[PDB]
């Protein structure tokens, strides 16, 4: 029948992005060695890796003292870091590093004398690969001049020492003729952009924005993220925050979050915190500058006990992302549907099939599934047994007929139906 395409380590789950480590685990303990009690927590969401913030020593805007080969001593020391990498494989969670030299100036790439900067990061690839870490990340490559010609050898060396590494690039330009002009010959790298950033006032362009991208890409493997370094909630309403992790997980790509968005952390309505890096609220002792803006349910220790949270969803949607086979590497078919929603399917011949129906409206629309276009190897049955619903009030386990479905307003769905063919 079918011989399985090979599985690498990062199709099999989720990433995680941390910008400011001192902001992640709370104040004071801004050490690399501090985030080792937290790695038991990150294996609750079961992400299959994380990218760690830029810890190389870097005087702001200074060329001669900006060295990618040693840790900025605010964060700890180099021998602290090998205790981090060794302890992380106790939970099978990879580590990736930033390699943008400037990250305290505005332009993050030192636009004057470009080639010496790339020459600096070219040597920096070899030392960290011999240091045992696996994967890098560059941001704002459009600030770098001629970024495609330099993207080759950085891909080449991280494929050189092994082929189980990773090389993530980033950009901001959301035009498709710039985006796939990077992926045209450079195919074995992930990329994150601001392509899905510009929502058309609560998601009017989204059902086109997934499909046009997923068609023009030639069905490679890509990566799904709102932006390269910012949170989820700095673009969206807080009412759509349960209808994107449903979409960002079951799409065919690599889910790239940031930190704190498994709470749905709000950078707004928190004063004194910057736009790039709020603090993550482990319990009530995470923000003592003001006791007022921190509620009870905006914390981990508020949502870890309620099953109808956002985190309790996120502990049962990433779990379905890494486990079931069709959501891993399956095939994606988005059939036509009603006026103001978006829906698709994922199939893998004899495995389970997962039916997704979303609701980007604001009303109580009834779901008109008007498919008629699928192959008969994967087409609609009568009933589906309703795996997951983003809003409480239904069964999550009952078989429901499809053409009398009656979605609630702003509710997406996860429907699981067997082969039966």
């Amino acid at each position, epitope marked *: 029948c079918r011989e399985l395409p090979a599985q690498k380590w990062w199709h099999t789950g989720a990433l995680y992005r941390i910008g400011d480590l001192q902001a992640f685990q709370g104040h004071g303990a801004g050490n690399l060695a501090g985030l080792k009690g937290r790695l038991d927590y990150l294996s609750s969401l079961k992400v299959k890796g994380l990218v760690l913030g830029p810890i190389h020593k870097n005087q702001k805007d200074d060329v001669a003292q900006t060295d990618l080969l040693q840790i900025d001593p605010n964060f700890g020391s180099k021998e602290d870091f090998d205790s981090l990498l060794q302890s992380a494989k106790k939970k099978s969670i990879r580590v990736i590093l930033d390699l943008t030299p400037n990250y305290r100036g505005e332009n993050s790439w030192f636009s004057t004398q470009v080639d010496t900067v790339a020459t600096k990061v070219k040597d920096a690839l070899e030392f960290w690969l011999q240091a045992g870490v696996d994967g890098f990340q560059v941001r704002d490559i459009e600030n770098l001049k001629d970024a495609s010609s330099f993207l080759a050898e950085w891909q080449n060396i991280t494929k050189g020492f092994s082929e189980d590494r990773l090389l993530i690039a980033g950009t901001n330009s959301s035009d498709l003729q710039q985006i796939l002009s990077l992926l045209e010959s450079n195919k074995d790298l992930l990329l994150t952009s601001s392509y899905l950033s510009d929502s058309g*006032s*609560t*998601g*009017e362009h989204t059902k086109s924005l997934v499909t046009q991208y997923l068609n023009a890409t030639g069905n490679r493997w890509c990566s799904w993220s709102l932006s390269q370094a910012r949170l989820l909630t700095s673009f969206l309403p807080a*009412q759509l925050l349960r209808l994107y992790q449903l979409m960002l997980f079951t799409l065919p790509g690599t889910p790239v979050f940031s930190y704190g968005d498994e709470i749905g952390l709000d950078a707004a309505a928190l004063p004194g915190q910057p736009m790039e890096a709020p603090v993550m609220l482990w319990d009530e002792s995470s923000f003592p500058d003001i006791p007022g803006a921190v509620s009870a349910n905006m914390t981990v220790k508020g949502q870890s006990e309620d099953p109808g949270s956002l985190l309790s969803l996120f502990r049962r949607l990433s779990d379905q992302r890494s486990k079931e086979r069709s959501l891993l590497h399956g095939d994606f078919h988005a059939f*036509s549907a*009603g*006026p*103001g929603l978006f829906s698709y399917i994922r199939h893998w011949d004899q495995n389970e099939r997962f039916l997704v129906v979303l609701n*980007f*409206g*604001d*009303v*109580g*629309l*009834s779901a*008109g599934l008007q498919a008629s276009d699928l192959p008969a190897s994967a087409s609609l049955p009568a009933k589906a047994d309703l795996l997951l619903s983003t*809003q409480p009030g239904r069964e999550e386990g009952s078989p429901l007929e499809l053409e009398r479905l*009656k979605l*609630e*307003p*702003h509710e997406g769905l996860l429907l699981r139906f067997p082969y039966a063919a």
Partner: antibody
Amino acid sequence: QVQLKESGPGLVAPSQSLSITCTVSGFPLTXXXXXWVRQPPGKGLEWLGXXXXXXXXXXXXXXXXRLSISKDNSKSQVFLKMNSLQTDDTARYYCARXXXXXXXXXXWGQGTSVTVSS
Amino acid sequence: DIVMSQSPSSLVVSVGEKVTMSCXXXXXXXXXXXXXXXXXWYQQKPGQSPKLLIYXXXXXXXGVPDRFTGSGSGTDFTLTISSVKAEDLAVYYCXXXXXXXXXFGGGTKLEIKR
């Protein structure tokens, strides 16, 4: 501004089909959703359907078997094709716009009447 | 489907007498996930199309004289005008906003005492 012109009222023989027009202006039609409602005078108001920017209809279940909503994207006009015109189809139809996926029918048209007797 | 009933059928109201009418829904129209309410008032003077006044039960549309302050929550709502003017004789429908087959209300008749 939101300006919504129509044909005004028209007359056809019963048991027929006809094109009820709604030519709109002052905004690009693809940025919103045009809907239609039904009112016979001295009675209530009844909603029947809504088209969209991708020519997709989500009709109401009551008047379901006897409507046909379509669109002409080029000439900035949403049509409507009734069918099997019985006695109590003599009523008024307003081509009413709303905000996209909100169902807040703000800008209405001038409305049209329809008459079916020979 | 949602039943939209309208309690007052006709109203004689003197000039400046604080119009207040009500409308009752079948189920709740206060969805406890956004914690907002979904109802809407429409005003039609004779010879015109209806016009939008209130969306989501508490907001005022763009370009409205602010004598109209509707209110209420739950299964019953109230349209409250502070004082009538010379041009307020119309018909006033209530609407479901969060449903599939959006059923409007019955209607009412506001006439002015003189």
